[PDB]
Amino acid sequence: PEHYIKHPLQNRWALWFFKNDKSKTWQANLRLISKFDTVEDFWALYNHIQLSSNLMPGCDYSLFKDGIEPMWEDEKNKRGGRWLITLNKQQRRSDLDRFWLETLLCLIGESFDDYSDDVCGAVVNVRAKGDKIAIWTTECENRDAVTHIGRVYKERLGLPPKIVIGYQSHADTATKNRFVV
Ligand SMILES: CO[C@@H]1[C@H](O)[C@@H](COP(=O)(O)O[P@](=O)(S)OP(=O)(O)O)O[C@H]1n1c[n+](C)c2c(=O)[nH]c(N)nc21
């Protein structure tokens, strides 16, 4: 068995793509690429798509658990929020791709212990003004889950203790940090 079975992931995941088109609504610009639920199928997908740093400004990738759309309105995101990584323009070259892949691995490898169940997915925004990476979680009032996910994520990214990252609820973003680590 170990010689021919793929390695199943805890969760099936869906990769989404967003291309800004002023001709369409935001939701009409968001498309599902494909889904996977093994390590092998994850790396097959990741190895055939563009690195985030090579996307055009205005594009996103989103990696979300099967059944959760990468939008605030999903029942699993409307009460939640995001740990937000803000990148300056110089970090598109130095950090964006390595941070995104670490984020992807934090998700599929369930790296936040028993609070990995609060994780909905992650989004990378490629923007001329500054790129963003974020991990979305389901409930912004869950202090322990949100704090634990942020502390782990910060250290997995290897961010310096001299900086903080913040967590904002989607309700506030849709109209301030609820947590900082
Ligand atoms: C309606 O306008 C929303 C938002 O204002 C716009 C830009 O979101 P975006 O995250 O692209 O902003 P940035 O380009 S990185 O710049 P900033 O504004 O975050 O500093 O895209 C829309 N948008 C975004 N998101 C994530 C949703 C959603 O989940 N749902 C609906 N319905 N719309 C959404």
From Swiss-Prot:
Is Cytoplasm there in the keyword field?
Answer: yes
**GO MF annotation list:** DNA-binding transcription factor binding; enzyme binding; eukaryotic initiation factor 4G binding; mRNA cap binding; RNA 7-methylguanosine cap binding; translation initiation factor activity
Please, which domain of life does this record's source organism belong to? Eukaryota
Please name the InterPro entries in this protein's record. Answer: TIF_eIF4e-like (IPR023398), TIF_eIF_4E (IPR001040), TIF_eIF_4E_CS (IPR019770)
Q: Which PROSITE patterns match?
A: IF4E
PTM summary:
Phosphorylation increases the ability of the protein to bind to mRNA caps and to form the eIF4F complex. Phosphorylation also enhances its mRNA transport function.
- Function, please? Acts in the cytoplasm to initiate and regulate protein synthesis and is required in the nucleus for export of a subset of mRNAs from the nucleus to the cytoplasm which promotes processes such as RNA capping, processing and splicing. Component of the protein complex eIF4F, which is involved in the recognition of the mRNA cap, ATP-dependent unwinding of 5'-terminal secondary structure and recruitment of mRNA to the ribosome.
One GO biological-process annotation of the entry reads: regulation of translation at postsynapse, modulating synaptic transmission
Put simply, this protein is called: Eukaryotic translation initiation factor 4E
What family does the entry list? Answer: Belongs to the eukaryotic initiation factor 4E family.
Assembly information from the UniProt record: eIF4F is a multi-subunit complex, the composition of which varies with external and internal environmental conditions. It is composed of at least EIF4A, EIF4E and EIF4G1/EIF4G3. EIF4E is also known to interact with other partners. Interacts with EIF4ENIF1/4E-T; promotes recruitment to P-bodies and import into the nucleus.
Oxidoreductase among keywords: no
> In terms of one coarse class, where is the protein primarily found?
cytoplasm
Tell me the segments the record calls region EIF4EBP1/2/3 binding. Answer: 7-10, 43-47, 102-109
Keyword list (alphabetical) reads: Acetylation, Cytoplasm, Initiation factor, mRNA transport, Nucleus, Phosphoprotein, Protein biosynthesis, RNA-binding, Translation regulation, Transport
This protein's GO cellular component annotations are: chromatoid body; cytoplasm; cytoplasmic stress granule; cytosol; eukaryotic translation initiation factor 4F complex; glutamatergic synapse; nuclear body; nuclear speck
- Annotated mRNA binding sites: 26-27, 72-73, 127-132
Q: Where in the cell is it found?
A: Cytoplasm, P-body; Cytoplasm; Cytoplasm, Stress granule; Nucleus
